[PDB]
Every structure is written in C-alpha cells, then in structure tokens.
Symmetry: C3
Subunit: 413 residues, 3 copies
C-alpha cells in the first residue's frame, strides 16, 4: 500500500546527532550554527547550519473594490400631465438612485393651483446617493496559506525549501517539521484597508453578499467595471393637500454603512501588515504580531538507518484533461486530470492544480496501475491563469483557463 | 494527586528502538513495516508494523430540511360587503402567504361601479409564494470530531484503536500521538448540498435563525413536519380611484434567497466529500482535500522503563442519575452522574455521556473518595437515544432519553 | 543575526535522561515524580518533579451590559390644533420609543365630531417598549489567551512559570513545550449569560453592531451609562374616516430579540465555566469540557551540551514615547516605544505593551544598534490602565492612559 504523502523520517534515536525543539513567533526568523561531532569518528566534527525565514501569509483574494461613503437625498418632482418615462429627472444623473412613481393620481387636493388634472400625469419621487467618497480598499479572502523558507546544511548536504506551516522538509540526514497554531484569519473574512496597506486593516465577518441594503457593511461598492449600489428599503408616501405640490416622504434608513461602522468602530478587530505585496488575485504579507507562535523540530542523523518515509518505486505521468468552474472563487474550479501509474499496483498520492507561479488546491488520489481520472478543486487565480495538473514539481504542459466568477447583486424593487 | 487523563508515556531516550515523525494529509492512510533490532539481544530482530487509516470527520447535525426556491405573487380581492374571515381566497391554498386586510374602507372613489358601500366590506390583499422547488439538503453542525484508526504491532504486541486528532494511543512498548491542524468546519456552520452528497456542498456562516425574511439564506425551509415560511417584510398600499376595483401594491423584496445566492455564488466556500455516511443525527465523511495535514509521532521502546502515564490505582463506578435538556442541540443536554471513587483519596478523570454507539461530550471530574455528583453537557443524538454515564468503556446500564430541541420560528406580522 | 525569540533547546539525544510526551485535557492538571539515574554517575540518582496546572482562558472583554426583553406597544394621540412639540405624550416617559407625526393633516373624514380643523394640529403616533426585563449579562471578546502554570524540579534546579499554549519553558537542564489545539472561542464572539457565570452561557456570532433593529440579538441593551434602544423599522399608517379619531397602524416587527432567540434556542452553542473571575476588562475561567486536549513534551538533559536557544549578548533599554487609540477595543491602542540596542549590530526581539498586571499585545522588533522607534498594537485594558513598553519583565516606568472606545449606535429615523 504505497504512498509518498508521509513527509518525514524513521529514526534510530541512539544514532541521532542533534535535536532542536522550540517555539518561534511567525514574524521571527532564526539562525543556528553548530559544529557537531562526526558519528563515524569521535575525534572529528562537521558543520551544521539552520536558517528559517519569517512566516509569510498568502491570501488568494477577490478585489471587491472600494467602499464608498455617501449622503442620502430625497427629491419630489411633479408633472400635471404625461407619464414618468417622458421626463428626465435631477436624480437620474446620480451614481445610485431608486424612483417611486405615482402616475395617474392627480385627483383633487393633491395638486398645486396650476394643475386641474384628475387621474393623470406623474408624481415621481427619487431617493439618491451623492457625495460619493472612497473610504477604503476591500478584499475577500478566498484561501489561506502560511509558509517559511527553511535552509539546512550538514557538512556537504545543503538544501533550501519553502515549507507549509504543518509540513516537514526532509534531506539525507536532516528533518525539519513545522507545527502551526490557530489562524487570526479565515476564508471568507473581508479585509478593509482605510489607508495604505502598511497601516493595517479591519476584519469583518458580516460584509454584505446576497442582500446589500444601504446601512450595511459594504453597502456601496465601486469596482472598475462600475458602481454596485445597495437597495434602499423603506416605504414612500405622498403628503397631499393644502393646494400644494405633493411632498414625498421616506421612512427607511438615512445613514450610510461607513458612518454606522465608524460610530461603533471599536467593536471590530484590527490587524497589521509588514512587507505587503499585492498581485492580480493575491495579497502576501508578514504579520508583525509576535503572539502567534509555531513549533519547530529539527533532528540530525548522519546514518544509513535514517529513512525518508516518502520513498516509493511508484512512477506517475499527468495530462490536464478538462476544466469547469471559475477563477477567483471560494467555490472554485474543477480540474480533471488523467494520471498514469506505473511500477506499482496501487499508489496514494497528492495531485495539485497549478499555474506557473502557485498551486491552488490538491486532491488525495487513490491510483491503480494504468490510467486514472482524478478531479481537483482549485481556489484562486485570475482571468489569464492557465491551470495544469501537477505532482511534485512536474506539471502537464497543457494549461486551461477558467470562467469568470459570478459575484453579482440582484436589486429587485 | 492521581489522574488517568495524561495519554502518553515517560521514556529513557537511550532505551528507545525507533522513532517515526512526519506530516500526513488527513485524506491519506499510511503503512510501515520494519524489522527492528532486539534491544535484549543485538544478533536478533523483531517485526514492527504501523497502520493509520484516513481521518474521518464526524459531525453531529440538525436536519434543517430542504431549501426551497419560490416565485413571489401579489393578488387583490374585493367584496363590497362582509368581513374578510367570511371569504375563502385564492392565496389561502398556497404553501406560504401573508394577507393584509382593509375592512370597512369603502368610502367613495375606492370602489368599482357595482359597489355603493361606504365604510364596509373587505379589500383583502395577499402576497404568496408558489412554484416551490427543492434546491438542496441543509444540515447545521452541532459538533465535530476527527478520528483515525491506528494499528500497532511490535512482535507479539498488537492493538488497533480509534484515536482523536489530538490524542495518543499507548501500548506496552509503543506510543502513537496525533497533533491536529485547523478545521475547515466549525460548530454552527450550515452545509448546503445542491445535489448528491458526493458532489460536495457550500458552507454558510449566515443561515437564518431568529428572523427569517424572504431573500435570506434559508428563508423557505421544508421539513417532513411541514413548511417553514419566511416573513415577508415590506409595506402594503391600495391605489384607489378612477372608479375601479382597488389595486394593491407591495414595496418589499421580490427575489428569493436561492436566486440571490446563485447570482453571487462565487462569494461562498465549497467543500467536497468521499465515502459519505448519513445517520439520524450525524454525517460522516473523508475530505479528499490533501492540503490539510496532521502531525504523527511514533516511538518504540521495548523496555521496562517505558511508563504508561495513565496508570493509577484509582477505581470508579458510575450510575446515571438524571437528565434535562435536549437532543440534537448545540446547547445540548445535561446528564447527572453519581460517581463512586475507591482506592484513592482524590482522582481527576474524564466522565462521558454516551449512547450505544458514540459519546456526545465529556467533563473533567475532580473526585474525592466516596460518592460524587458530576454534570455533563452532551451535544447530539436523536429522539430515541438513551444516554449513559461512562468512564473508559464502562457505562452505567441506566440510559435516559432527552427532550426534543426547540428550533421554531416565530412569525409576528 | 541574533534573536531571543526561539523558546526551547538544542540537545544531543544520547545525553538525555528523560522524555515525557502525552496529550492532556485543558481542564486537567498533572503531577509527575521520578528518581532519575545521575548521568555523571550510574550508581546515583536525582529527583525529577513536574507539575502542570489546568489551562486558564483569559478573555479581554467589553461589558456590553444587560440584554433586555420587552413588550411592543402602539398608541394614537390626537389634537385638533397645535403642533406635536407643544404636547407631552404617554409614550415619552418610556425607555425606548419612536414617534411619527402627521401635523396639518386634519382635512375632512379624518376627524372626530369635536374637531372642525382643516390642515392643522397633530396626529402623533408612538411605538414604544415597556415591561423591560433584564435576561442576561453580555460580553464581547476582545482577545484570548490560554495559559498553564508549569513547575519543574530536577534535583537542585526548581522553577515555576506561566506558559502560553504554544510556548515553551526552558531551565538549565529541562524544557517543557505546550502545543495547543483549536479554540472553542474566537475574537468578536459575544457571550450571553442568562444566570450566574457558573451556569454557563451561549455563544453568538451575529450580535447586533452597526444596525440594531428590534428583533435582533442584542437589540435592547442596558448599560450603566443608560439604555441603548434599537431602531424599529416598519411603516406607519393612519386609517381615517367613519367620523372618528385617527387610528395608527404599524406593519413592522412586534416580537423582541430575546423571545425570537428562545423559540429557536437549540440552534446556538452553549459553553460552561468553572472558577470564573471577572475584572474591569477581563473574564478568566477553566472550561470543564475534557474533549479539548493540548500536547505536552518534557525533556531532561543534565549536560553541558544542553543549549538555551534564547541566549544572546544583546542588551535592550526601553522608554514609552507616546500613545493613541483606545482601551477595551478589538481595534485597540497604538503604543510607541523608544528601544536602545547595545552589544549587538542587529537584534530581532519581542516588545510588549503592558500595564501592572498583564500584557495586551506584542510586536516583533527588527532592531539595529542605537535608538529604534517601535509601534505596538495593544488590545484590552480599562479607563485607568497605564500601558508601558516592556521586554522580558523589564518595563519602562512611563505608563500612558488610552482614550475611551467608540461603541455608539446611531439611530437615524
Ligand atoms: C496597525 O493597523 C492598525 C489598524 O489599521 C493601525 O491603526 C489605524 O491607524 C489609522 C491611521 O490613519 C486610524 O484610522 C483613522 O485615522 C485618522 C487620522 O489619520 C483618524 O482621524 C480617524 O478617526 C481614524 O482613526 C485608525 O486608528 C486605525 N485604522 C483603522 C482601520 O481603524 C495601527 O496604527 C497599525 N500599527 C502599526 C503601524 O504599528
Ligand atoms: C466537489 O464539490 C464542489 C461543490 O459542490 C463541486 O462543484 C459543484 O458541481 C455542481 C454540479 O452539479 C455545480 O452545481 C450546479 O451544476 C449545474 C449543472 O449540473 C449548473 O448548471 C449550475 O450552474 C450549478 O453550478 C457547482 O459547480 C458545484 N456546486 C455548488 C454547490 O456550487 C466539485 O465539482 C466537486 N469536486 C469533485 C467531485 O472532485
Ligand atoms: C453549563 O452551561 C449550560 C448553558 O448555560 C447549562 O445549561 C443551562 O441551564 C439553564 C438553567 O437556568 C437553562 O436556562 C433556563 O433555565 C430555566 C429554569 O431555570 C428554564 O425554564 C428555561 O427554559 C431555560 O432553559 C438552560 O438549559 C441552559 N442555559 C442556556 C443559556 O441555554 C448547563 O446546565 C451547564 N452545565 C453544568 C453546570 O454542568
């Protein structure tokens, strides 16, 4: 029952030369040098060197756009004759507006002196948002990954590798394992940056999604493809009589999402960020908070009894078959892989979906000799990303683009 | 100060034969054979065998029922005389409806030609939902548990045991410890399955609970005991005049929860599932995602210095005393246990609430010699479950049924 | 590249005397005695003693106040002349109320017999909440910390220290490391206590924040500084005619947050609490749930090869420079520290913000020889707290008070 998925080693403890074991803050790097006694010869020694980089957070993100503050406005129009489609209105120039029409409701005692209409015209009323101000950048977390660069040297062996926070690196005589605490961040958290990235942000758990009303977090969003307006929500009413022009009233919410947030600002969680790097579909940074600690173990054994537990005679070859689903998505894309197994009856291994740069997901494949169809869910990437089936570092040269994510609001009156 | 709650071992490292140490994906199993040198005799060797099953997720769940898509409909009725209770209406046959009556509001200029009424009758108006379509199955997570079957053999010792993700298994000469990363799932997450279980689902963090409006996630739920309708929310209005029958208008939301979800579908998180098994109150599966890795440590020491740290002279006997609270609940049930302690002045131990199959919770009991009353919160089970006080595998033969969970909506106009 | 942030040790495994390794419930303490063979002399032995306390949870909190149940009431007033400011109304004495006025709308067929007014007066209508009952205490989690007291003795060495759940304690010959599972609690969770603390509580993920409507969790909050009333939300309407006094109607929600919670109570998560201790800005307790297990490792090596990995020649001195931001906040306060580095070219270390009792946060500082300006985010504390820049246990004697947190609702009609 072969697998290459166990990353570590089998050891005889009497034939081990060195063990490091400690907790380290994610934001801390660490360096260790020591001359170790040669187990082959007690009168000799060999250099051992360890280097650990600071832990980098990698979030695949959705660029939700800029959060807008706004002012609420209510205006009443009146035409004694003609329907509401015939007339342009002041509010129709605005970035976001709702209109409620009262066509054919002229009667008597709802009219100014100059209107003798009865059951005609249009008393159109508009609520609208102006004084639109960008207050911050908004990203929704699609997925999370935490990595350290690990460099080992034992005499003439030397290898650097990037290692996930609950993975191990294995060389001929050295194993390094990371064990990784709780995350401050979660998939689907929304991050709000009110200024530059370096100045940190706020985490939100309830950013508007399926139903964005004016007053919610993320109510008014501006993307480069255009505005995303919230629904208003509240009832309209004419006050009619005193031989005057009708005066509309709105009972719904008047105060914007941003203003409502700022008033109770200290109800939310902050985070800070050093060395931020933004890409099309990702945000990378180091969290300077030193209260988050990982566990590191290092073990040296320059002996033939040291087993790499990943070693197998099994050989695989990959071909990217087909794709469906979307890029930049927490639901994601479905990549189909044709996977040949040779030299083995069966093999349990990890098959990954990757582009040129990064991998966006991985499935545990239960392979039997010959061809195998394996499905992978990937989460992330952008318009142009060409996703390939991969194992270790070998990828299929066939790469497939995904479809755009469905992230649309539906604003039904 | 005796306790049996430390699961592991005390070791002299020079008298250890083997150490395995590695990271493994939850979805991966693993097998290891090796002939180890006999520490008693250097010219002999003994077989060591390790088998780890894939990690199974066990969620106690609530069957919230099926999520329904629907079409919104508004219809106006009119009777010139008689009150609204006297008449049956078209909308009253429908699965979900709200009605707003305007009794005794006939006046003049709110009537058709055939109605000379003044301050009489009934202008009943109905909003209602039809074209009800099941779109998926819905489960709310009550609790979570992650387990692997661990099998050890060292020569003539052999034991298999199911082990939680941050527990250890201990035999005469072998200890296996699991250390378990972050969970993709949380208690109170709601899982939506749009097709068969095997095709995966969506996680939701904001499924409607205390106030379900039409348009929310989970707005229209169908259980076998009947429909659960959302509230509508929006104002009504007659438009009256032109010597016609009154025409009602509704300003509230027209689009269903499902349709609003699907439009922005890629805002949410997917998960997938292999080997799903559904029961009355639980869902078990293996997550094929290979990016989630646990840490495994194995240590062999066939020596008398190897201590089982759980060993104590303390002896306990249990009796299930009484119960209150509910089954199938995140709040849960309160089981009272009478626990006798003998052979010891004091004893710290774990007392568990279990039925025939599984345990639903466990309390740390601080026992003193003689009788002790211990309370346990259990979370899960179903109508028929008979919960018993247990320690190790010994249970009280008395089992007690809990009461039904309160999971009702209250829809006040 | 010096750092003091690696908490643990470098070891030669053949020169180790003892290793303990096991899982332990958070609610369990543990004691271990053993006479170990003296490595210096095989015919002698030395006493080794380990004591671990139960794990204590420390939450910095916000006292949100008491959650109130209430009864909804709608009353209509009428004055044939004079505006609504001129008259006191029955509802104006109540703890929470909204009022909707219809000034100058007398007309004809909206009046009792005693009112011949036309376009005058005031038909004021009030919705209001009475029968206010406290149902529980409410705390919002600002931050979380999990600690155990660890006591070691190896012969003549003895040290007790409080250790975070993913930190290690290091002495001359002994290292103890804690590795800490998932948390049941998260920052920004709101905890509701319906009775005394000892009887446990409910966790909520959606407690009202930026927009509190009547019917929401936390809709009606009572603090010592006064009531916090929700918004109502729903439309008003006069029914007019039949030569009577106007009768107002409200279409919005009638049922309170509490009642709506209790109806579906078993949708939520409970927790329980032993040995609770409440302070101005914090809640400390031990969770009696025994299903949460940490990993403990202990390693003894009474040998000169045992390295304390935190040892450096680097020397620091601190001065608290300035502060901005707030106490009792998840966003928190920004403390500026002047940090002198001597004896070293560069130094990576942790700089903490603390008052007399506890530390409220810590930053990873990348120091170079001489003066360094370092920023720290602290989360927690109260009005009087005087926050100091600290490293190890040495603090600057200058302490600085923060500003009050902004936690206000804005209720715009
Ligand atoms: C790490 O990140 C936090 C959170 O972003 C930092 O606090 C932030 O500081 C900004 C400074 O602009 C504050 O936002 C606003 O500042 C203006 C003045 O520029 C002020 O008038 C407004 O009232 C508002 O507070 C805010 O305190 C805070 N950001 C947010 C989103 O609340 C913290 O200083 C950073 N720590 C570092 C660099 O060490
Ligand atoms: C693992 O689970 C995910 C999530 O459930 C799988 O993607 C799902 O595939 C279904 C297929 O029915 C998709 O739902 C709908 O499919 C119809 C066609 O049958 C389509 O017209 C609709 O627009 C809709 O997308 C959907 O992509 C997705 N499910 C959800 C709830 O979004 C994924 O394929 C699974 N991976 C495996 C088996 O490896
Ligand atoms: C640990 O904590 C849980 C949760 O707080 C405990 O259950 C709680 O017990 C209280 C007892 O007051 C219950 O609340 C109410 O009790 C009255 C009677 O006093 C009852 O008429 C109401 O219907 C309501 O249930 C409730 O079951 C529960 N608390 C909540 C907030 O739901 C559990 O007993 C505790 N376990 C221990 C001490 O071992």
């Amino acid at each position: 029952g072969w697998t290459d998925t166990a990353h570590g080693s089998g050891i005889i403890p009497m034939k081990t030369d060195l063990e490091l074991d400690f907790s380290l803050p994610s934001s801390a790097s660490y360096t260790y040098r020591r001359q170790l006694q040669n187990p082959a010869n007690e009168q000799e020694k060999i250099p051992f060197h360890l280097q650990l980089s600071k832990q980098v957070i990698h979030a695949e993100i959705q660029h939700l756009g800029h959060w807008m503050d706004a002012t609420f406005n209510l205006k009443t129009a009146f035409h004694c004759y003609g329907s509401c489609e015939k007339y342009a209105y002041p509010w129709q120039t605005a970035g976001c507006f709702i209109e409620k029409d009262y066509e054919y409701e002229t009667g008597w005692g709802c009219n100014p002196p100059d209107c003798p209409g009865v059951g005609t015209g249009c008393t159109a009323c508009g609520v609208y948002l102006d004084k639109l101000k960008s207050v911050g950048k908004v990203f929704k977390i699609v997925s999370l990954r935490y990595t350290r660069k690990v460099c080992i040297q034992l005499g003439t062996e030397q290898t650097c590798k990037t290692v996930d926070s609950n993975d191990c690196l294995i060389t001929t005589s050295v194993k390094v394992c990371l064990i990784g605490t709780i995350s401050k961040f979660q998939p689907s958290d929304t991050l709000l940056f009110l200024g530059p990235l370096q100045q940190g942000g706020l985490i939100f758990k309830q950013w508007c999604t399926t139903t964005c009303q004016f007053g919610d977090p993320g109510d008014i969003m501006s993307t480069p493809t255009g505005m995303k307006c919230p629904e208003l929500n509240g009832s309209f009413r004419k006050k009619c009589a005193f031989a005057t022009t009708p005066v509309c009233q709105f009972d719904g919410n008047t105060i914007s999402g941003y203003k409502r947030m700022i008033a109770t600002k200290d109800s939310f969680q902050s985070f800070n960020v050093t060395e931020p790097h933004i890409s099309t579909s990702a945000l990378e940074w180091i969290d300077p908070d030193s209260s988050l600690r990982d566990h590191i173990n290092v073990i040296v054994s320059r002996d033939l009894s040291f087993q790499d537990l990943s070693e197998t005679p099994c050989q695989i070859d990959l071909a990217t078959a087909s794709i469906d689903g979307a890029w930049g998505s927490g639901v994601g894309f479905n990549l189909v892989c044709t996977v040949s197994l040779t030299e083995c009856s069966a093999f349990l291994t990890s098959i990954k979906a990757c582009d040129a740069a990064m991998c966006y997901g991985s499935t545990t494949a239960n392979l039997v000799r010959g061809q195998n169809t394996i499905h992978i869910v990937g989460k992330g990437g952008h318009s142009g990303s060409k996703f390939m089936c991969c194992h270790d570092t070998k990828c299929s040269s066939t790469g497939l683009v995904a479809a755009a994510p469905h992230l649309d609001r539906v604003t039904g009156y």
